[PDB]
Amino acid sequence: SSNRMYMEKSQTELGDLSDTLLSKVDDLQDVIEIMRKDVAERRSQPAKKKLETVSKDLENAQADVLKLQEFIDTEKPHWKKTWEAELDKVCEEQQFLTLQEELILDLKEDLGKALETFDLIKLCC
Amino acid sequence: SSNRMYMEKSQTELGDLSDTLLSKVDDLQDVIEIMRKDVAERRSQPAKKKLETVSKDLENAQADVLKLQEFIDTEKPHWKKTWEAELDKVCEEQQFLTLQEELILDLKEDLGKALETFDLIKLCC
Structure with a gap:
């Protein structure tokens, strides 16, 4: 694998990772806003099963966020040397x-x- | 042949051409200065055979100068596009x-x- 090919494949991988996480965060924001609107204006509570699944979706997004940062941190120094x-x-x-x-x-x-x-x-x- | 390899080989060729011509011009300048010094200070003339060989060396350097300029003129636009x-x-x-x-x-x-x-x-x- 050439330096150039490594650059293009690893940047593409970065884009896919942040894209996947962006969509998960978007989904979470939608689910949570439905909850907030119901509690705030109707004092109507979410189903218990939904609280559970959101709790775990939030935990999973936290883990993905850490992995995304680690990808950037590990790849960036080599990218800069390639560009230099x-x-x-x-x-x-x-x-x-x-x-x-x-x-x-x-x-x-x-x-x-x-x-x-x-x-x-x-x-x- | 890749774009990068073409760049490096054609630039190397340019360097060899201008180098060869630089040395011919240096040689000509030396021969001609010997002549000038002799005429100017001693009114002593160069041998006829030397006038002849210098005449032809000058003609050959003129031709090489034109070829060198043509090399630069023909290669430069492609080099710029490669860099861009x-x-x-x-x-x-x-x-x-x-x-x-x-x-x-x-x-x-x-x-x-x-x-x-x-x-x-x-x-x-």
Whole structure:
């Protein structure tokens, strides 16, 4: 597996993990708002079985949150090193082009002066 | 041949071409300065065979200069597109990380409020 392929697969994995958790949190928020609205305005209580399942869904989301943070924490340092490698290489290649462009201008100048000098020499002869 | 490999081989070729020409121009400058010094200070003329060989070395360097410029002109647009592709990709991946880091903060916040609200609900019951 290349550095580039590892980057793209691991970032895709990150996106899938946070996406799955986002949808679980969205679902939890909906269920809990139904509960809050009923208690607040009607003093009507949720079913006991629902309190139980929400309790466990909250516990599961807490666990997933920790795993998501661990994924970011473990992968991030390697991602930065991968980017640094690619960016440093591009920078050096752009600087090379720039240096080569200045060099050819210097060569044309130097060759032009050599020609003129050689022409003077031939005239003198 | 990959984009990256083409970049590295074609830049190496550029460096070899300008290097070869630099050394030819250096040699020409040395030969011509010997001539100039002799004519200027001694009014002593170069050998006819040397005038001939320098004439042709100058013509050859002129031709090489044109070929070097053509190499730069033909390769440069593709090099820039290659760099743009790599830089754009890195930029998007860095932005992705940043967005994912903000997302997990939002998730922790939202999950934390859901927990507190659920605890209020349970208290009410």
